[PDB]
Amino acid sequence: IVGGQECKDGECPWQALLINEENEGFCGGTILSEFYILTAAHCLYQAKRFKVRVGDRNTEQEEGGEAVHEVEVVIKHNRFTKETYDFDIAVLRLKTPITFRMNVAPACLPERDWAESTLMTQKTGIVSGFGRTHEKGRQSTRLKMLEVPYVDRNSCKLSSSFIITQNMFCAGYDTKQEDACQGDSGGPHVTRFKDTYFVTGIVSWGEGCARKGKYGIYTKVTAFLKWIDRSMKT
Amino acid sequence: RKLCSLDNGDCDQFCHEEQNSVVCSCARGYTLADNGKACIPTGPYPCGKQTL
Numbered sequence A: 001i002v003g004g005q006e007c008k009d010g011e012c013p014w015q016a017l018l019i020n021e022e023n024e025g026f027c028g029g030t031i032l033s034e035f036y037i038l039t040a041a042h043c044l045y046q047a048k049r050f051k052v053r054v055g056d057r058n059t060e061q062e063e064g065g066e067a068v069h070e071v072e073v074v075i076k077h078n079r080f081t082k083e084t085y086d087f088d089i090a091v092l093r094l095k096t097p098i099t100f101r102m103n104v105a106p107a108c109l110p111e112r113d114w115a116e117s118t119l120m121t122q123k124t125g126i127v128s129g130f131g132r133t134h135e136k137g138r139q140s141t142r143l144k145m146l147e148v149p150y151v152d153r154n155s156c157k158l159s160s161s162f163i164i165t166q167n168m169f170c171a172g173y174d175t176k177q178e179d180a181c182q183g184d185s186g187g188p189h190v191t192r193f194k195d196t197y198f199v200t201g202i203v204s205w206g207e208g209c210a211r212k213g214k215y216g217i218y219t220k221v222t223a224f225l226k227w228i229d230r231s232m233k234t
Numbered sequence B: 001r002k003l004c005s006l007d008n009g010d011c012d013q014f015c016h017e018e019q020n021s022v023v024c025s026c027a028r029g030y031t032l033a034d035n036g037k038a039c040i041p042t043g044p045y046p047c048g049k050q051t052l
Ligand SMILES: Cc1cccc2c(C#N)c(C(=O)NC3CCN(C(C)C)CC3)n(Cc3cc(-c4ccc(Cl)s4)on3)c12
Pocket: A082, A083, A084, A085, A135, A136, A162, A163, A179, A180, A181, A182, A183, A184, A185, A203, A204, A205, A206, A207, A208, A209, A215, A216, A217, A218
């Protein structure tokens, strides 16, 4: 992430990391439940074979808490399209169940009707990940998190040189140099409500990072609440 | 402002009007408290809670 602080012991439990053959974190993820991980569909094309790591805050220095789980099933959204990134979401089924502890916990999934009206109308939300700290910089090895204010839909669509479908939403800053970036993709965007956090988005893309006039484009998770439950049902 | 439109109708989590009256609910991992407004963590690690 560009700016923000590093996640302190326990702050970002629902954070998940996608590692390829060479055990590298290319994307992010959100812990839905012991057997389920939420992520962006576009990430699925970033690796030929990958696994998931959880409860990690320093890629280069094991904290004894990490845990690597093999992906058993990949449930992508058949309507996703690289051409527009519309329907940029995916759910992953783990071979083995996760074990919740200090930095390994799941984010809560809300109710579309409630979410859209309560959560989504909050002041800001929080995104996190081991993404690049600068647009053209390199991947971070410290799990990071940043508080991104919500952006008006109109302002959003308008500020983007790309088609902002209804499965997307802006979050981030107009000019301030704080915004997610590559590597946080598929990462978690959550919204606190009375000290409880709900998965509200999925790091998707942006016309660069932190750029003035450009925001962060996330996958509006409420639109797939129904789709996510079903993907879990089987 | 009115009902759930007012301070989430006093629910800890999910609120949803229905016949002039509020109804509270919680995500899975939490069980509705006596007052029917708060949400009690069932397991040790309910979702949405930082681990300190
Ligand atoms: C690394 C990086 C550096 C410099 C420029 C870009 C840049 C351009 N242009 C993008 C990017 O996404 N491009 C998209 C690809 C999908 N198309 C679709 C509509 C066809 C729109 C442009 N990334 C990579 C990047 C950017 C991010 C995020 C930034 C803020 C977030 Cl929230 S997520 O994550 N990875 C960039």
